[PDB]
Design a protein around this ligand. Structure first.
Ligand SMILES: Nc1nc2c(ncn2[C@@H]2O[C@H](COP(=O)(O)OP(=O)(O)OP(=O)(O)O)[C@@H](O)[C@H]2O)c(=O)[nH]1
Ligand SMILES: Nc1nc2c(ncn2[C@@H]2O[C@H](COP(=O)(O)OP(=O)(O)O)[C@@H](O)[C@H]2O)c(=O)[nH]1
Ligand SMILES: [Mg+2]
Lengths: 426, 430
């Protein structure tokens, strides 16, 4: 039936992908050995979407692991769920990308990608009906950005009408885990603004603030961040993977959420979020989840939606809910928050309600916003890039890899056009 | 003899269809396996096989398997013929283009042929029933296309449809106006009559009048099912006055370009209030003519009544009925268009509106269902056109439709037709 291919970019892509498949394996009750222990038919009903049926009935998740630094993939195989993935779908060469977008994209990753595409074609040929592709990666990483970019390019060229989206880590506004990031971000964003259907911006600082504040934590790690992200992913794919009212296909979401082809960028969000023991003072109702979802503090992207206007909003729900509470809350919210929404698009909300809640919760929901604070992200990125590029810092590496300066110029031009287009509608 | 083929397109149509058919099963004493352990007016809506197995006459169509798979795994899987359940591999994505053109074209032929054989089995065919959401891509496009095809093929066969009218305040999608206007364009050019219902009004009604907690689509569909069942019940049982759908066409359509009868149903009350509430025909009619009890959010007092069709069930004597109608005639808060001497027609049915086990509606020995036209619906069309005018002025989301095979001229033409409809209501309102 309807199927989605998940391509995990190197490093953070593979890690987040690991947690992603862990969550999905928990969702459908799939043992890490590939065995189905699930207690319901809805588990295996349409499960063919993310999984394939083996001869022994063991379920192989449909995914492709791509990294130039196998150490991560080695750690993945060393993981408990590493046995789910057949050794065939592991595709890696051995070199560092050195966080060089050009080196990864043009040279060493290009000697790889063909095999990845072969595997993609295999999976695609094994698809009854292909909805599209999804790419978990990171902006600022050489492999993630370069290889992810090359991959979405080739994949789109191979599958133009198919859905293509990516969950991409975006550079942090204050600190940075690497230098040269603005270059990779700019180039990747250029190729991403032209190539994909949609992309989800997520900054670690936002998740740090959220997890530290909302969930009241002490010493967790990236796993929890990836867990959250994968929870969001599971949410949208849950709307896809289970019955309910106003069931939302991915392209339907893409249709409702994107008025203008070139502005597809979104802000993911999730509810409910409560710390241990503080949950007892909270009640589970649609108003609560909506209050959490529309809270600027719960935005997983670094931004302040208070500055901007919503072009489109999609709130997906999970569990048993009354359509009324949703309707009333959306109406009241849109009513009192007026001027936070674009005036020439009446009814900016897209509602989808799944009857199947996530494990452990009576109800859950996720928030996909569209706003110009993304333009603000593009502003800071453009600024940093301009600062670094003006003095031609680190440029000799990319130039050494055969990357022409005109491409940087073009990328910046397109980014400026993009943010300008964000400012155009406001 | 007199038979009708039901049609359910989209989640709305299918679920409403489910409610409708379970209600039918309850009314005819049939059980999910297609058995019933005088009523041949059920043979009207049900065919039969050598084993005495009674199966419904309907066609379920969803471009995505989704709900229909729930139906296939549902209790009534033993009821419906496996061929009557038709599923594609993906939806219209709230895009009129797909459903009307890109997807449905590879499906609709099958659907049409199945409807044709289903029509071949009929001793006689009065018409069709099309259930869909208004503004939903699948329902909109596919029912537009299907209505065109059916209109071409079956000619003068009555075409009736129950559409869910988009609510003014609340919406499940941003693109609903486009699909809605394209729908009413291509549908108006074909459909004989269309019953408009707005979920918000149903919410207000059930909440306020039924005095219940915040409900879901279920009992909503049950109410719609009650209305539809009341109509078909006017057809499905021998009362004092029996009514053919052609008569609904005759009475509710003074002009070919205007058919949009608004549904209203009374009494609607809690089981507790039913004890204190005295049910009389006059009071029920008074409740029927109440603007708050209408199934659409349009206010009838902003326009005049053109045609009004009242369908009675259970215990009703035409004496106090005509008396009540006169009592209504005396009231000038309710005004009728000047050139219409009388817009009233009264159906009478002996069988009462049976209640569904686990249902929220109180049991009553009588009930009334109004089908009537007003220009307040033109006001609704106006607000719809306004929303569309905005979103179209900014050319939002158009690239989908365009890339998927729609032309801007179609949108323009549709809008022009809407303007024409507005002026039609305006001129007729004189
Ligand atoms: N009254 C009522 N309306 C419904 C119901 N289900 C869906 N709707 C209406 O349908 C609209 C949503 O579009 P759908 O009809 O679900 O579209 P679809 O059938 O899924 O087909 P696609 O648009 O291609 O996905 C909402 O605005 C509702 O008004 C229902 O069970 N009862
Ligand atoms: N959410 C999340 N982000 C990560 C994780 N690991 C790395 N990152 C992000 O990725 C960036 C580092 O880039 P990296 O992927 O290591 O460069 P690459 O080796 O060229 O792909 C940092 O800014 C981090 O924010 C992770 O486990 N979770
Ligand atoms: Mg649908």
């Amino acid at each position: 039936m309807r199927e989605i291919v998940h391509i995990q970019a190197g490093q953070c892509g593979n890690q987040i992908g690991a947690k992603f498949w862990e969550v999905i394996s928990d969702e459908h009750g799939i043992d890490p050995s590939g065995n189905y222990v699930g207690d319901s038919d809805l588990q295996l009903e349409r499960i063919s979407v993310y999984y394939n049926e083996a001869s022994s009935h063991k379920y192989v998740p449909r995914a492709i692991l791509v990294d130039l630094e196998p150490g991560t993939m080695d750690s993945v195989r060393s993981g408990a769920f590493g046995h789910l993935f057949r050794p065939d779908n592991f595709i890696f060469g051995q070199s560092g990308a050195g966080n060089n977008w050009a080196k990864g994209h043009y040279t060493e990753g290009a000697e790889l990608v063909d095999s990845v595409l072969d595997v993609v074609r295999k999976e695609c040929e094994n698809c009854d009906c292909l909805q599209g592709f999804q790419l978990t990666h990171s902006l600022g990483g050489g492999t993630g950005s370069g290889m992810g970019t090359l991959l979405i390019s080739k994949v789109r060229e191979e599958y133009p009408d198919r859905i293509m989206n990516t969950f991409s880590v975006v550079p942090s506004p204050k600190v940075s885990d690497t230098v040269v990031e603005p270059y990779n971000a700019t180039l990747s964003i250029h190729q991403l603004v032209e190539n994909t259907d949609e992309t989800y911006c997520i900054d670690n600082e936002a998740l740090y603030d959220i997890c530290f504040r909302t969930l009241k934590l002490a010493t967790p790690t990236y796993g929890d961040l990836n867990h959250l992200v994968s929870a969001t992913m599971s949410g949208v794919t849950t709307s896809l993977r289970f019955p309910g009212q106003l069931n939302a296909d991915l392209r339907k979401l893409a249709v409702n959420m994107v008025p203008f082809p070139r502005l597809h960028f979104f802000m993911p969000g999730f509810a409910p979020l409560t710390a241990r023991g503080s949950q007892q003072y909270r009640a589970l109702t649609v108003p609560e989840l909506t209050q959490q979802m529309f809270d600027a503090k719960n935005m997983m992207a670094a931004c302040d939606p208070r500055h901007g206007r919503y072009l489109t909003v999609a709130t997906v729900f999970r569990g048993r809910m009354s359509m009324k509470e949703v309707d009333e809350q959306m109406l009241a919210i849109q009513s009192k928050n007026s001027s936070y929404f674009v005036e020439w698009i009446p009814n900016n909300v897209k509602v989808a309600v799944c009857d199947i809640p996530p494990r452990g919760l009576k109800m859950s929901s996720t928030f996909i916003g569209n706003s110009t604070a993304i333009q603000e992200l593009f502003k800071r990125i453009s600024e940093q890039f301009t600062a670094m590029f003006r003095r031609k810092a680190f440029l000799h590496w990319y130039t050494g890899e055969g990357m022409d300066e005109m491409e940087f110029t073009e990328a910046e031009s397109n980014m400026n056009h993009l943010v300008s287009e964000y400012q155009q509608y406001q | 003899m007199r038979e009708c083929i039901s049609i359910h397109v989209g989640q709305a149509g299918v679920q409403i269809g489910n409610a409708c058919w379970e209600l039918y099963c309850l009314e005819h004493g049939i059980q999910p396996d297609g058995q019933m352990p005088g009523d041949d007016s059920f043979n009207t809506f049900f065919s039969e096989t050598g084993a005495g197995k009674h199966v419904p006459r309907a066609v379920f169509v969803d471009l995505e398997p989704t709900v229909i798979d729930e139906v296939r795994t549902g209790t009534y899987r033993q009821l419906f013929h496996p061929e009557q359940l038709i599923t594609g591999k993906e939806d219209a994505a709230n895009n009129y283009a797909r459903g009307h053109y890109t997807i449905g074209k590879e499906i609709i032929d099958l659907v049409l042929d199945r409807i044709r054989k289903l029509a071949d089995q009929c001793t006689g065919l009065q018409g069709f029933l099309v259930f869909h959401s208004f503004g939903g891509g699948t329902g909109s496009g596919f029912t537009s296309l299907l209505m065109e095809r059916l209109s071409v093929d079956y000619g003068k066969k009555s075409k009736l449809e129950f559409s869910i009218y988009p609510a003014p305040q609340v919406s499940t999608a941003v693109v609903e106006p486009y699909n809605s206007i394209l729908t009413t364009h291509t549908t108006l050019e074909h459909s004989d009559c269309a019953f408009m219902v707005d979920n918000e009004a149903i919410y207000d009604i059930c909440r306020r009048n039924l005095d219940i907690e915040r409900p879901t689509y279920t009992n909503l569909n049950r109410l719609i099912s009650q209305i539809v069942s009341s109509i078909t019940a006017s057809l499905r049982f021998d009362g004092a006055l029996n009514v053919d759908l052609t008569e609904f066409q005759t009475n509710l359509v003074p002009y070919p370009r205007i058919h949009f009868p608004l549904a209203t149903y009374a009494p609607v009350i809690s089981a507790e209030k039913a004890y204190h509430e005295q049910l009389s025909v006059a009071e029920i009619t008074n409740a029927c003519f109440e603007p708050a009890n209408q199934m659409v959010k349009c206010d009838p007092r902003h326009g005049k009544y053109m045609a009004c069709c009242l369908l009675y069930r259970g215990d009703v004597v035409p004496k106090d009925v005509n008396a009540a109608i006169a009592t209504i005639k005396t009231k000038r808060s309710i005004q009728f268009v000047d050139w219409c001497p009388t817009g009233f027609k009264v159906g009478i049915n002996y069988q009462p509106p049976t209640v569904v086990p686990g249902g929220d509606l109180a049991k009553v020995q009588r009930a009334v269902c109004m089908l009537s036209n007003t220009t307040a619906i033109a006001e609704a069309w106006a607000r719809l056109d306004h929303k569309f005018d905005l979103m179209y002025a900014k050319r939002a989301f158009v690239h989908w439709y365009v890339g998927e095979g729609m032309e801007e001229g179609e949108f323009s033409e549709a809008r022009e037709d809407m303007a024409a409809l507005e002026k039609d209501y305006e001129e007729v309102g004189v």
